[PDB]
Design a protein around this ligand. Sequence first.
Ligand code: NAD
Ligand code: NAD
Ligand code: UPG
Ligand code: GDU
Lengths: 310, 311
Amino acid sequence: MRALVTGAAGFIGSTLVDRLLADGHSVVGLDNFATGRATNLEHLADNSAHVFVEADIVTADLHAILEQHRPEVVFHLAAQIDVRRSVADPQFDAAVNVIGTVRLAEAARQTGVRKIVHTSSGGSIYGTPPEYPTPETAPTDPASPYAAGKVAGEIYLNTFRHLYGLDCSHIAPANVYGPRQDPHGEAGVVAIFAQALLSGKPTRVFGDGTNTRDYVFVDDVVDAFVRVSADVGGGLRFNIGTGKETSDRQLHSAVAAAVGGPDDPEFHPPRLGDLKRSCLDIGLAERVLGWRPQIELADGVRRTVEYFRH
Amino acid sequence: MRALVTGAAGFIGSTLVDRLLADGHSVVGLDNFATGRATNLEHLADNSAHVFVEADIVTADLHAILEQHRPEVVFHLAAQIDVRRSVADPQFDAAVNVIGTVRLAEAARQTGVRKIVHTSSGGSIYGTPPEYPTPETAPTDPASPYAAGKVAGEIYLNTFRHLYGLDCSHIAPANVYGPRQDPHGEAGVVAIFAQALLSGKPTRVFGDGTNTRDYVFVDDVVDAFVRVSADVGGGLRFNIGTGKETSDRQLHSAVAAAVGGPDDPEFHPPRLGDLKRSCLDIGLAERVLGWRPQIELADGVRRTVEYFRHK
Ligand SMILES: NC(=O)c1ccc[n+]([C@@H]2O[C@H](COP(=O)([O-])OP(=O)(O)OC[C@H]3O[C@@H](n4cnc5c(N)ncnc54)[C@H](O)[C@@H]3O)[C@@H](O)[C@H]2O)c1
Ligand SMILES: NC(=O)c1ccc[n+]([C@@H]2O[C@H](COP(=O)([O-])OP(=O)(O)OC[C@H]3O[C@@H](n4cnc5c(N)ncnc54)[C@H](O)[C@@H]3O)[C@@H](O)[C@H]2O)c1
Ligand SMILES: O=c1ccn([C@@H]2O[C@H](COP(=O)(O)OP(=O)(O)O[C@H]3O[C@H](CO)[C@@H](O)[C@H](O)[C@H]3O)[C@@H](O)[C@H]2O)c(=O)[nH]1
Ligand SMILES: O=c1ccn([C@@H]2O[C@H](COP(=O)(O)OP(=O)(O)O[C@H]3O[C@H](CO)[C@H](O)[C@H](O)[C@H]3O)[C@@H](O)[C@H]2O)c(=O)[nH]1
């Protein structure tokens, strides 16, 4: 296929690019380096099947870009990804995550694109749900601007599906981790911990450390994107996770055991906008797509740490 | 109370300003006249309980405005209202209806506002539901960017409610008609029919003319806004309509009757983005707010046609 990946310079995006190239596709990567890194893509300098476009989804001529490259599938991973930043500046988050997605859809529907694979946020869109693990049938109830924008993005793509037959599916991952996740942010706890613990720098958990997330390895998530790119699951969201809860404190212990050295995080005040629990029911992805996660947390943590050691 | 009304120079907005003033409130109006009209507010020039601020919700310093005026309730009616325009320029529609709403919420949560009453679109957000009349429990399924953005605004306001305890309710009207609806507007079939049939100018219906809407009189809609502004229905949407369906063809006949002339529209092709049926279950509003619509279509059309004759 001819693929285009927005957010290609990012953690998941760069990993998806690699997988798509490995499967023999041609890939256009698109990014503005808001949070992405050139180092994530530098190994591709001499890869014959990849081309990079530096562009802001909010302001670039996406019509002209899509007209030139004519991708069959757009994997839409460009976004403002930090929940706390979305609280600090909800307008900016909405511009990137809602307006950006709208502009992309409007360009795609005019340029013969078959399908947009959206990245929603399985970990946050349900807010405090009726049950854990949470199925896609549960109502969305976002409690951060980030979560709200991801839902809105789903709704807009569904609308473009009705209007124009521009197909879409929503990949809704839980908490993604693994190599290339930026170690120097406030989001990406696994990378934050690994980097800090390897460097002997201080680490922290928030509140009482009991918050849970569902940690799913990047390679597994990438496989979900590939499967859903076909003519399957039009208009549908798929939760992509493990269906297992790990507390902040337990996560810290796992990373420290992998690094070696102390397991003694500081405790900081709770962060407004952060949910207490997150756990995804992944039955739908299993049946429809034949998707199952391969990498258990212990294995994933080892691989991640080992990646940061070098 | 101190109230602020966005979209105050518009059809429903200006009517709401009047009601709030009549009830003894102070009212700040806000508008950028994208679609609004100076004539809608001109009678208020000397009313000291009313202040008007010209402002674009997309770019204006809404924080500074709300800080100055300190409204207890914001009635948010400012929006891009035309479904066809939303299809033609989804980005612009999203900028006004989504970004605009987000900026207002962000400003309001910082400036002591108690509640934002949002205006959704009961008529469009449900798409093609299996239930008519459609209850609020029916999943949203927008088929136009306009409808999508309306849902998006609801969700964002629900989010600010979780985050900050900034209360919200979503008034979701069906098809609103009555005095002050722009006769030369691209939208607003009742006004469009009255303006044309009064001018003896051509009229038209889309498809085969069988598409239905739920026609609710502006005064009834305004009353719902008032009722929901209290500490009630937090994070809930309220369908505001009559729960009765009128086909495009039937409405033409009903306006034609009021005007008195011929009942003979042209039939033009369906418009991309338009739904085939719309009808709201108004039970929740009755149970929770005590709200019921007073004005039947015949009475409302007569009052409207009469307004147009007076000019
Ligand atoms: N990491 C997770 O746990 C997780 C789980 C659920 C959802 N997601 C979603 O997955 C996607 C990838 O996130 P990630 O973890 O790889 O983070 P990331 O920051 O590494 O990737 C996001 C990429 O989008 C780019 N981007 C941001 N704004 C842009 C704009 N205006 N124009 C162009 N590019 C822009 C960034 O520069 C970056 O390269 C995002 O949509 C995110 O919301 C992430
Ligand atoms: N009329 C209906 O049948 C109906 C039904 C359901 C929903 N609504 C909603 O009711 C509200 C009022 O609509 P109306 O029928 O009075 O139409 P209208 O066009 O008369 O009123 C909308 C007003 O918003 C103003 N506005 C638009 N963009 C703005 C911006 N960026 N900044 C500031 N002001 C801006 C316009 O100038 C106008 O005065 C809207 O939110 C609309 O979507 C209308
Ligand atoms: O130094 C740190 C950083 C984080 N955490 C905890 O780790 C968890 C995860 O936090 P973070 O890595 O910031 O991710 P989330 O805010 O949960 O969101 C991530 O996962 C979502 C899906 O659930 C995606 O949508 C988002 O883009 C992505 O940033 C939380 O419980 C935090 O309290 C710590 O204990 N210490
Ligand atoms: O000349 C015309 C114009 C319209 N119609 C019909 O009248 C009905 C109503 O159309 P409008 O354009 O008046 O309104 P919409 O149903 O498109 O309503 C939309 O536009 C409104 C603005 O007036 C609100 O914003 C509302 O929320 C939004 O869904 C439709 O079935 C349409 O086919 C005609 O028969 N003849």
